[PDB]
Amino acid sequence: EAAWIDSDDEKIKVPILVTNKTKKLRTSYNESKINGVHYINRLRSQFEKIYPRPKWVDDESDSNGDINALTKILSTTYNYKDTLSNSKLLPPKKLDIVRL
């Protein structure tokens, strides 16, 4: 469903064949002046012709324990080593040591 209804969009009318690029939008050779809803439907289909819809927009939506629980906490991390710890233990094999 549309969540906003532009009442003032339909009472527009576009003469279409003045433009050199929108000549793909005419659905016959007859029509040349078209109301708002028909033109915007054609224009939406034209933008479909430009970029096809990827799979995430149409279908992937966010709106006992879940099995996505590892994946999400990976996804909200880039550094998985706990460098924010200040663990007060020493990590092995790698000395943060600076010559002074």
């Binding site: 969540a3 906003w4 003032d8 033109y39 224009l43 933008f47 970029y51 819809r53 939506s61 909200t76």
Partner: protein, 358 residues
């Protein structure tokens, strides 16, 4: 203040400053328009050769840059330049004393926002004409409608609908009429960066938290979200080449690459631009090409590419990480000492507090 013996020629040695640059196409190929204080520069993207510079230093620093096919729109203090080939063809001085924050181009219109939370509308004198010169109106954003204006974009297939995003929420206008056709509810975070999408209806928003929201308007709904731990987002871009990929540019200098189908980050670039000078200031995929042009506040402008995928059988899963391509840099700090290097006035050495020669 005027000199008699010498005169200013250009400020040699600058690529960008951090002001969000604009991308444009001539036919199949791409140009880049960046800002340097009061003077903007134009580049081919395929070689980063300098194409044009401003005909004049502007009297105040350029705040915004948009670019349609042959016409680059600069925006300094109260006035907005319509430039062909770096030459001032039409100055559009706005009827406030408020400072021009953002700007956008669609249809027979131009739309530019000021810091009085009010956007100005500039029609073309005809659709036969090419640059917008007729002043249409001024519409505003009062504090029941939205916050401080962060961006104006036009998402495609939206007949005279203007998408004005704030730190709070998103508004839509019929700029023929001047009527608010829709207001979005507040997002609870402080929205910092907008970007349109090669899918329909979606505006991507990167907030002051590490969160990117894909947002519909025909739904009016925030369809997906994307998290980032502890980074302030600066730029968003979409790779329209042939696999759905999203570019998240921090102000920490880091560039994060997502594939929304695999719901996974691909590679995060670290430190392609200096954090103290604004981080990554603006990164944008060239439309329908696997090339992202990044721009930092360190007087640097880099290019990166995705290599085509090594997996013959898969493709989309196995992704080569982005890879360094050509770049024009400058001194990040101001230059401490210069000299004239050669005898024929070809080369100049310039050393800065950036700790480098150029």
């Amino acid at each position: 203040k005027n000199s008699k013996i010498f005169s200013p020629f250009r400020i040699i040695g600058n690529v960008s400053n951090g002001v969000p640059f604009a991308t444009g196409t001539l036919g199949s190929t791409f140009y880049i328009v960046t800002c340097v204080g009061k003077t903007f520069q134009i580049y081919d993207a395929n070689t980063l050769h300098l194409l044009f510079v401003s005909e004049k230093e502007t009297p105040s620093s350029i705040v915004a840059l948009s670019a349609h096919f042959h016409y680059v729109y600069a925006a300094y203090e109260n006035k907005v330049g319509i430039y062909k080939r770096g030459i001032e063809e039409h100055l559009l001085e706005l009827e406030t004393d408020a400072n021009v924050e953002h700007l956008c181009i669609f249809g027979d219109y131009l739309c530019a926002s000021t810091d009085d939370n009010s956007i100005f509308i500039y029609k073309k004198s005809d659709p036969q004409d090419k640059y917008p010169s007729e002043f249409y109106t001024k519409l505003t954003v009062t504090e029941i409608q939205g916050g401080e204006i962060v961006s104006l974009q036009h998402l495609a297939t939206y007949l005279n609908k203007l998408t004005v995003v704030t730190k709070s929420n998103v508004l839509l206008f019929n700029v023929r009429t001047g009527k608010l056709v829709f207001t979005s509810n507040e997002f609870p975070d402080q929205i910092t960066t907008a970007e349109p999408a090669p899918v329909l209806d979606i505006i991507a928003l990167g907030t002051v938290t590490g969160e990117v929201i894909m947002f519909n308007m025909r739904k009016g709904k925030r369809i997906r979200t994307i998290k980032i731990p502890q980074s302030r987002i600066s730029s968003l871009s979409f790779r329209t080449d042939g696999s759905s990929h999203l570019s998240v540019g921090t102000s920490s200098g880091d560039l994060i690459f997502y594939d929304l189908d695999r719901r996974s980050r691909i590679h995060v670039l670290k430190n392609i631009h200096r954090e103290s000078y604004g981080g990554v200031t603006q990164a944008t995929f060239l439309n329908g090409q696997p090339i992202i042009v990044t721009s930092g506040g360190d007087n640097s402008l880099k290019e990166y590419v995705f290599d085509p995928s090594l997996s013959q059988g898969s493709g989309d899963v196995v992704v080569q990480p982005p890879r360094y391509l050509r770049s024009r840099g400058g001194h990040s700090q101001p230059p401490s000492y210069i000299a004239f290097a050669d005898s024929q006035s070809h080369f100049m050495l310039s050393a800065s507090k950036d700790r480098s020669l150029w």
